[PDB]
Amino acid sequence: PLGSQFWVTVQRTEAAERCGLHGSYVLRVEAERLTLLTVGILEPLLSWPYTLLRRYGRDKVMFSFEAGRRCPSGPGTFTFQTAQGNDIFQAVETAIHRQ
């Protein structure tokens, strides 16, 4: 009921370093935002409203999005290793289309 959830592993980017992101997380595709969660059970860390994203994309090894300046994380690129990048991408495209 909270949205589709995927285990991911963060890759080094400026924004990920600034936000202290390292290792594995759940990325959840919600109705109006993405949320990053860690094990405490799952605890939320950051959320990015779709309206505040610049772009997003994927290949067979990763999923990546770029946050604008108004996100709580600050602006920049967040990239995550996953073999489910197309699944995340489709979930996000769909949630944005529904919005």
Domain segments of the chain: what residues?
A: 1-99
Interatomic CA distance for residues 79 and 76, integer angstroms:
10
Would you tell me which CATH number, out of the four given (2.30.29.30, 3.40.50.300, 3.40.190.10, 3.30.930.10), belongs to the domain 1-99?
Answer: 2.30.29.30
Alpha carbons 32 and 17: distance in angstroms, whole number: 25
Cross-sheet strand order for the sheet of 33-39 = 42-49, 33-39, 24-29, 4-10, 76-81, 62-67, 53-58
Could you give the CA distance from residue 38 to residue 78 in angstroms, rounded to a whole number? Answer: 16
Residue type, 78: F
**Residue whose token pair is 């969660």:** 37
Residues 73, 79, 80, 82: is their CA dihedral positive or negative? positive
**Documented resolution in Å:** 1.6
Torsion of CA 48, 20, 69, 3, to 10 degrees: 0
What method was applied to determine this entry?
Answer: X-ray
Strand 76-81, strand 4-10: pairing: antiparallel
Residue 27's H or E segment, with its range, is strand 24-29
Residue 29 CA: distances (Å) to CA of 3, 35, 69, 71: 5, 7, 20, 16
